[PDB]
C-alpha cells in the first residue's frame, strides 16, 4: 500500500517552499568569526555537547579522553579518561552533574560529575545494545535514550540500568537522534535513507520520512518542535515536517559533492548550520534553500556541531584536535 | 580579573593541561593497528601467535591491534573510526578460492575507500600450508600467468591479484605490503613492526619537506 501512501503525500500537490516563502527578506551573508579555539585535545574530535548553563561544554576525541571546557574562559574544568578510545557520542544532563559517552564498545558509560568526594567516576553503565553507539542524549536526571548501529534504539533508566522501552522498527544502522523540546518525542535518522519519529511513553513509531537517497548522518529537531532537518551522505540536506509528513525544503547545490557530518539549528529556527565533509561547515538558510555563510576555519574536517542552548554561540569540532567557537 | 575562585580554576586548568601534555607523549608513541579479515581467515590465531584489543611491543615501541567483531556486519560507518591507524592488517585466507574472490573484492573496496586511501594496508596471506597441501595434491588468468614449483606460482598469483588493485588504483600516499604467513609463524610481530617503521618513514619523508 506504498502507492496509496505516496498518493496521499502527493494530495498536497502545491508543495513548493520556493513559492510560499518567495517574497520574504533574505537573511544575507552571515559572517561568523572564530572567538575561541579550544586546542587541548590530541586527535580527531568525534562528538561534543553543550550544557544547560550555556557555558560548560563537553567533548570527546579519538585519543580516548572526555574533556569538559569552559568556553567563557577557555579552561578545562574536567578531563575524564575513557576505557574505549572510539567514542562518537556525547551528552550533558540538564542538571549538569552527569555526562554520558559511548561508541564502538556498545556501552553508554555515565560519569558522575560533582560527587560528594569531588571526583569523576562512572556512575552507571548500560550494556544492552548489540551495535556501536551512535548518539546518546540525556532525557532527564534519571532517563537517557540511546540509538546504536544495531537498527534499534532504547530508553534507559539510571537507577536500574535496564531499558524501559526499546524501538526496534528500522532498517540499516541508526546514526543520530535528537529529542523534542517537550522531551516527549524523539526522532532517529539511519543508514536506510529514512528517519522515523518515536514516542518515548509508548515506544512505537508514528511516521516515516523516506526522502533521501543515501545514509542519513545527522538529524536535529526544529526549535518549534514540529520539524527537523536530516543531513545525509548524498551531499544534500532536507527539512521534514511532522504534520505534513513530507519533505519541505532541499538544501542542495551543484558544487557540493561531500556528504553531511553534523546538523544543528539556531535558536529561532531561521539558520540551519550544517557540518560538511568538505573541510568546512556551511550555514544554510532554513526556508530559502540558499547558503548564508561558510565556517572555513577548520583545517582537517568537520565532525560535530552544536548550538548553545540560548543561541549565544555555536561550536564546531574538526578532525584536527581543535574546537572553534563561532559568533 | 583574578579572584580566589578564578585563580583556583586557572590552576586546575593548568594541571589538566599538564596531564594532557604528559599523555600526548604516550598517545603519539603507541601505534594503533586495525585487524581485518573474514571468518575463515585465521586473523585470531595471528594475534594468538604474539571489540577485542591486544597489546604487544617489539623494540619497546608499543603496538595496540584491534579486532572488532561485535558489529552488525555493516562497516560503512564504524570503519571511519579507524581513520588515524598507522596500518591495516587485512588477513586473507588464500586456501579458499571461492572466498578468495570475496577477499579480493573487499580488499579492493578497502583500498579505494575515501577515508582509508591514506592508510597503508599490511597484507597477510594467512593460509599457506593449506595452500601448499591443496596445490601439491575459478580464475581463468592462472593458465596465462608467469612467475615474477606450482605452489609458488599459486602463491604469487594471489599476491599479484591483490597487488593489481594495490597498484593500479594507488594514489602514492599509501602502499600495500604483502607477506606470506602460516599458522605457526612467529615473525608476524616483527613483520608488522618493520612495515610500520617504513610507513612512518614514508610519512616522515612527506612531512619533512623532502617529497
Amino acid at each position: 500500500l506504498k502507492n496509496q501512501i505516496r498518493d496521499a503525500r502527493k494530495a498536497c500537490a502545491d508543495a513548493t517552499l520556493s513559492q510560499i516563502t518567495n517574497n520574504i527578506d533574505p537573511v544575507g551573508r552571515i559572517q561568523m568569526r572564530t572567538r575561541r579555539t579550544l586546542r587541548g585535545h590530541l586527535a580527531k574530535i568525534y562528538a561534543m555537547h553543550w550544557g544547560t548553563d550555556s557555558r560548560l561544554l563537553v567533548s570527546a576525541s579519538q585519543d580516548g579522553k572526555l574533556i569538559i571546557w569552559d568556553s567563557y574562559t577557555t579552561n578545562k574544568v574536567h578531563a575524564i579518561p575513557l576505557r574505549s578510545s572510539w567514542v562518537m557520542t556525547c551528552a550533558y544532563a540538564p542538571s549538569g552533574n552527569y555526562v554520558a559517552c559511548g561508541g564502538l564498545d556498545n556501552i553508554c558509560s555515565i560519569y558522575n560529575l560533582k560527587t560528594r568526594e569531588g571526583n569523576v567516576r562512572v556512575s552507571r553503565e548500560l550494556a544492552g545494545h548489540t551495535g556501536y553507539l551512535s548518539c546518546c542524549r540525556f532525557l532527564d536526571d534519571n532517563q537517557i535514550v540511546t540509538s546504536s548501529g544495531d537498527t534499534t534504539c532504547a530508553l534507559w533508566d539510571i537507577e536500574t540500568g535496564q531499558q524501559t522501552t526499546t524501538f526496534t522498527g528500522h532498517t540499516g544502522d541508526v546514526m543520530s537522534l535528537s529529542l523534542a523540546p517537550d522531551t516527549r518525542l524523539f526522532v532517529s535518522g539511519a543508514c536506510d535513507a529514512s528517519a522515523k519519529l518515536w514516542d518515548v511513553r509508548e515506544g512505537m513509531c508514528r511516521q516515516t520520512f523516506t526522502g533521501h537517497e543515501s545514509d542519513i548522518n545527522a538529524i536535529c529537531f526544529f526549535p518549534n518542535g514540529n520539524a527537523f532537518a536530516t543531513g545525509s551522505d548524498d551531499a544534500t540536506c532536507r527539512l521534514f515536517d511532522l504534520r505534513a509528513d513530507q519533505e519541505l525544503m532541499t538544501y542542495s547545490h551543484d558544487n557540493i559533492i561531500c556528504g553531511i557530518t553534523s546538523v544543528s539549528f539556531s535558536k529561532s529556527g531561521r539558520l540551519l548550520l550544517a557540518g560538511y565533509d568538505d573541510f568546512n561547515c556551511n550555514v544554510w538558510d532554513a526556508l530559502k534553500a540558499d547558503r548564508a555563510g561558510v565556517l572555513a576555519g577548520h583545517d582537517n574536517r568537520v565532525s560535530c556541531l552544536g548550538v548553545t542552548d540560548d543561541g549565544m554561540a555555536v561550536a564546531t569540532g574538526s578532525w584536527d584536535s581543535f574546537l572553534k567557537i563561532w559568533n | 580579573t583574578l579572584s580566589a575562585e578564578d585563580k583556583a580554576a586557572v590552576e586546575r586548568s593548568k594541571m589538566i593541561e599538564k596531564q594532557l601534555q604528559k599523555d600526548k607523549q604516550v598517545y603519539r608513541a603507541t601505534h594503533r593497528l586495525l585487524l581485518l579479515g573474514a571468518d575463515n581467515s585465521g586473523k585470531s590465531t595471528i594475534v594468538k601467535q604474539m571489540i577485542f584489543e591486544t597489546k604487544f611491543q617489539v623494540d619497546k615501541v608499543n603496538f595496540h591491534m584491534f579486532d572488532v567483531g561485535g558489529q552488525r556486519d555493516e562497516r560503512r560507518k564504524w570503519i571511519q573510526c579507524f581513520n588515524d591507524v598507522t596500518a591495516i592488517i587485512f588477513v586473507v585466507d588464500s586456501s579458499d578460492y571461492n572466498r578468495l574472490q570475496e577477499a579480493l573484492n573487499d580488499f579492493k573496496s578497502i583500498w579505494n575507500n575515501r577515508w582509508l586511501r591514506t592508510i597503508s594496508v599490511i597484507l597477510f596471506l594467512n593460509k599457506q600450508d593449506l595452500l601448499a597441501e591443496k596445490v601439491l595434491a575459478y580464475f581463468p588468468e592462472f593458465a596465462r600467468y608467469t612467475t615474477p614449483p606450482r605452489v609458488t606460482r599459486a602463491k604469487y598469483f594471489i599476491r599479484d591479484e591483490f597487488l593489481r588493485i594495490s597498484t593500479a588504483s594507488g594514489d602514492g600516499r599509501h602502499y600495500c605490503y604483502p607477506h606470506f604467513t602460516c599458522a605457526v609463524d612467529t615473525e608476524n610481530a616483527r613483520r608488522i613492526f618493520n612495515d610500520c617503521k617504513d610507513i612512518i618513514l614514508q610519512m616522515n619523508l612527506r612531512e619533512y619537506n623532502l617529497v
Epitope: 529514512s194 543515501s214 551522505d233 551531499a235 559533492i257 556528504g259 | 555493516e74 570475496e102 579505494n112
Partner: nanobody, 126 residues
Framework: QVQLQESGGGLVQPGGSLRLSCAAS????????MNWVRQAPGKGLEWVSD????????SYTGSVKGRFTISRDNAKNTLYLQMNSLKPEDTAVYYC?????????????????????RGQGTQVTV
Amino acid sequence: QVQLQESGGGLVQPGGSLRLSCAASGFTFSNYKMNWVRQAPGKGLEWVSDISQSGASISYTGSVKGRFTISRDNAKNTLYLQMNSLKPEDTAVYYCARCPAPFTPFCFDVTSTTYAYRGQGTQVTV
C-alpha cells in the same frame, strides 16, 4: 524512497541466453556506481560485475568475465546485464545493487545480509 525491481529471468537452457534489466527510481542514476549480486541456494550473496559512473571502469568475476556483459543507461535510468554463455551452475537470484556514496568509487557494503538499496531480484533457473 530508493526502489529497485528486476525482470527477465526464470527460463534458461544449458548454454542458453537471456537479458536482465533492473529499474531504478528515487535517486540519480549517474552519480552512483551499481554492482550485481548473485544469491545461489545454500550460499551467501556473491558478486558478479561492476560499472562505474558513466561506464568509466568495468570489472567482472573470474567465473563471469567472457560470458556476461554489463550495460547501463543513465538516460533510461536502468542497468542491464546481458547473458551470452551459460552453464547450469549459475542458477540464482540477481540483486541489482549499488553503494550509498555518490561521486565516489567506494562500494564497501553491497553483498551484506541486509541492505537498503538492494532490490528484490528475479529468479534465474537453468
